[PDB]
């Protein structure tokens, strides 16, 4: 069986926001969620759409970036790690 991780407060509130009705994921689901939000929430730059801005959205302090990139994959996990329990 895949690996349940466990959001902490912040970005669980983020994933129900985005539609999430449960407290543990697989990664791939909360990469999921997290994608669905910020698609929702418009934050792909216009231009550069592997780019995502943060500097204006909660995002940018759940993740602690002004902007990232898709195609960074492993910081993603890691500013998504540092917001699971441990
Ligand atoms: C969950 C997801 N599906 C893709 C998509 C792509 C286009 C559309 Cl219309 C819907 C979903 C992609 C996306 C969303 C927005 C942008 Cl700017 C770039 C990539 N994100
Ligand atoms: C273009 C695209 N690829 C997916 C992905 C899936 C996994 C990873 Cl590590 C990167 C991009 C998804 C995404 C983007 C950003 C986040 Cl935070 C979550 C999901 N959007």
């Given at each position: 069986?895949?690996?349940?991780?466990?959001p902490?407060?912040?970005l669980?509130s983020?994933?129900?926001?985005?539609?999430?009705?449960?407290?543990?994921?697989?990664?791939?689901e909360?990469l999921?969620?997290l994608?669905?939000?910020?698609?929702?929430?418009?934050?792909?730059?216009?231009?550069?759409?592997?780019?995502?801005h943060?500097?204006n959205?909660?995002?940018?302090?759940?993740?602690?970036?002004?902007?990232?990139?898709?195609?960074?994959?492993?910081?993603?996990?890691?500013m998504?790690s540092?917001?699971?329990?441990?």
């Amino acid at each position: 069986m895949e690996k349940l991780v466990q959001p902490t407060p912040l970005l669980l509130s983020l994933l129900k926001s985005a539609g999430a009705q449960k407290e543990t994921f697989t990664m791939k689901e909360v990469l999921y969620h997290l994608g669905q939000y910020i698609m929702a929430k418009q934050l792909y730059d216009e231009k550069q759409q592997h780019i995502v801005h943060c500097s204006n959205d909660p995002l940018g302090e759940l993740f602690g970036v002004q902007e990232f990139s898709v195609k960074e994959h492993r910081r993603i996990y890691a500013m998504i790690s540092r917001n699971l329990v441990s």
